[PDB]
Write a protein that binds this ligand. Structure first.
Ligand SMILES: *C[C@@]1(O)C[C@@H](C(=O)O)C[C@@H](O)[C@@H]1O
Ligand SMILES: *C[C@@]1(O)C[C@@H](C(=O)O)C[C@@H](O)[C@@H]1O
Lengths: 252, 252
């Protein structure tokens, strides 16, 4: 296991790390969220930049990054543009997505970026290598908001992310049944049993899948998302309740 | 689903019910435990009669039952002699085991008894029918402290308990791996999906299996055991922490 350390936070051992998401639509809302979020307890801050309305503006996005860092200078910060294709709030061209992520990398303001695997192998690999050349880690991701692939499919997808240089492969899937929740847990455990070279983040979404957000220590999900006031995906629970369950499981 | 109601407690719907086990070696220790336990919060009291040293005396056992009922006149009370064969503290003859359970039934002091399936079909059936003739419910049980059977085996075992007249089939198994924990959860869900006629109680023991004690609402375990001060089987967590997790899962 190649753990990922950002400052003194170690991702891939111990209790799953708690991530929360900023969702503001402009500089002022992002600032206000960051100032509120610093009075909550969590491990990693995600900026969900697909909520940001002025996405085309290099000045706007960098100003917003700076206000986040003014508020929380030290916190591990993950920059995520979630495409609408994968459950996010808007769509941009592939070239603008690559440009955006490269700008985040160049800023020095972010510790990690999210790259969606299905953007395309060559573009993802190039961007991973650029991130790594500038001391930024990559959460490589995939999301299915409609259904749960087979465990075999999910495992091969996470392995491909490793092969492309992901520091932390991540997959989120939508259950249609309770059985699908077990499928996601099975895929997670398969990574732990057979392919434990990188920390992986997994989740089954929605209320049916919520156990997958709690049982990461058991089956091998290295991080889990909670809601400060509003969820950034279906199935997230209040961040303090999440923390309470994680602590109980760790110390049991 | 044929739920089991004792007073206003419904087993087999909603949040899994919390059971705690009273363990005392003699009449005075049983009394002291009962008086301490009534200051804890839980749904069902189990008396682990196999901890009682003067087991040969049916009258001593009945005196102890009466002290428990003096202390907690209303609580749902489950009378359980767990054989050493199935992880308990001592062994008695089959005839004395049946005699003890029939005395518990006749006393009117208990709401439920535990009968171990592998005592033998004919003896179990006769005792179930006796319990039912005197308005006592049966938790029919099986325990493997060494290993986890296949999901197919566990499902057929729980179904056999239903066929013998169990009100609540119960199985506890020991994981040797994380995979075995998933097997137990799979068998639990199979009952919910395919064989949902009776509430079932399931658990994977030890620290590895603790998620199975927490996720009963999602996969279909009707009750779960917590520890007031000392665990009555490996893997139980403190009863207040158990309750906290159950509430979070129910309200998520
Ligand atoms: C990784 C991610 O897509 C997971 C979501 C979730 O299911 O909790 C939250 C998103 O904000 C995040 O980018
Ligand atoms: C039912 C039973 O065997 C379950 C044990 C457990 O694994 O929690 C506790 C015992 O006290 C109980 O009789």
């Amino acid at each position: 296991m190649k753990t990922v350390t950002v400052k003194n936070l170690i991702i891939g051992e111990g209790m799953p790390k708690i991530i929360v998401s900023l969702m503001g639509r402009d500089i002022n809302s992002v600032k206000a969220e960051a100032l509120a979020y610093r009075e909550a307890t969590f491990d990693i801050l995600e900026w969900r930049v697909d909520h940001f309305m002025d996405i085309a503006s290099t000045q706007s996005v960098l100003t917003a990054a700076r206000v986040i860092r003014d508020a929380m200078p030290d916190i591990p910060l993950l920059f995520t543009f979630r495409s609408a294709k994968e459950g996010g709030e808007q769509t941009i061209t592939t070239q603008h997505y690559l440009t955006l992520n490269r700008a985040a990398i160049d800023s020095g303001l972010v510790d990690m970026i999210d790259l969606e695997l299905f953007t395309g192998d060559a573009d993802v690999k190039a961007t991973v290598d650029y991130a790594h050349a500038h001391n930024v880690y990559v959460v490589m991701s995939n999301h299915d908001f409609h259904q749960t692939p087979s465990a075999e499919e999910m495992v091969l997808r996470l392995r491909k992310m490793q092969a492309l240089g992901a520091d932390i492969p991540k997959i989120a899937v939508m259950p249609q049944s309770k059985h699908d929740v077990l499928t996601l847990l099975t895929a997670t455990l398969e990574m732990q049993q057979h392919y434990a070279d990188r920390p992986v983040i997994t989740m089954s979404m929605a209320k049916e899948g919520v156990i997958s957000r709690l049982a990461g220590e058991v089956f091998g999900s290295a991080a889990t998302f909670g809601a400060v006031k509003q969820a950034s995906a279906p199935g997230q629970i209040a961040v303090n309740d999440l923390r309470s369950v994680l602590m109980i499981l760790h110390n049991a």
